[PDB]
């Protein structure tokens with residue numbers, strides 16, 4: 078059995094028996110499975126654009142697309158954009174849960190951060206992308222493109238996205254990047270859109286835009 082190098086979270090996640098698959102154990106209930114199927118039926122375009130592919134289920138294990146699979150040197154950041162169980166967000170509208178090399182920067186997921194500390198941790202995450210300003214700018218711009226479309230699409234989705242994370246990935250050489258929504262374990266049906274989750278995404282767009290333009 079090969080344990081998957083999770084950047085954050087608590088769930089048991091292992092490499093699949095075949096290439097490009099991770100198996101995530103549904104720890105507490107099968108709600109995550111119920112929610113993937115609900116989104117498949119009602120919001121299929123959202124699922125295709127923004128969520129790792131669900132390949133199927135093996136007992137309590139979801140077979141998911143490995144978002145790190147096609148990367149030589151992946152850098153991963155987990156940002157919780159849905160409501161936390163009980164606590165307020167560590168950066169006001171969202172909580173950075175972890176990132177590649179965060180230990181080197183004395184990152185603490187329990188620490189409440191100022192705007193300046195929040196921006197500095199995102200800058201820390203980008204340092205592995207090296208000194209080629211142009212390439213790292215293109216990574217930020219590609220993230221902004223997808224997050225802006227996500228924020229727009231969220232207005233017409235009647236789900237409370239409790240506990241969901243954005244998984245940001247870029248390669249050391251900045252040749253490839255993506256961002257996707259994961260962790261649907263606490264997601265619930267509601268009669269309106271989720272303004273709290275939209276506010277998390279628009280706040281990230283503002284921060285990344287500032288980084289992409291700052292000389």
Ligand SMILES: Nc1ncnc2c1ncn2[C@@H]1O[C@H](COP(=O)(O)OP(=O)(O)O)[C@@H](O)[C@H]1O
Pocket residue numbers: 082083084085086087088089090099129141142143144145153155242244259260261262
């Ligand atoms: N499809 C995926 N591809 C790659 N890494 C993933 C994927 N889903 C989750 N991860 C990794 O696992 C961590 C936890 O995922 P998440 O679904 O939030 O589970 P948990 O219940 O442990 O919070 C993420 O921070 C990320 O590092």
Ligand SMILES: [Mg+2]
Pocket residue numbers: 086240242260
């Ligand atoms: Mg999670």
Ligand SMILES: [Mg+2]
Pocket residue numbers: 125126127128129130
């Ligand atoms: Mg995809």
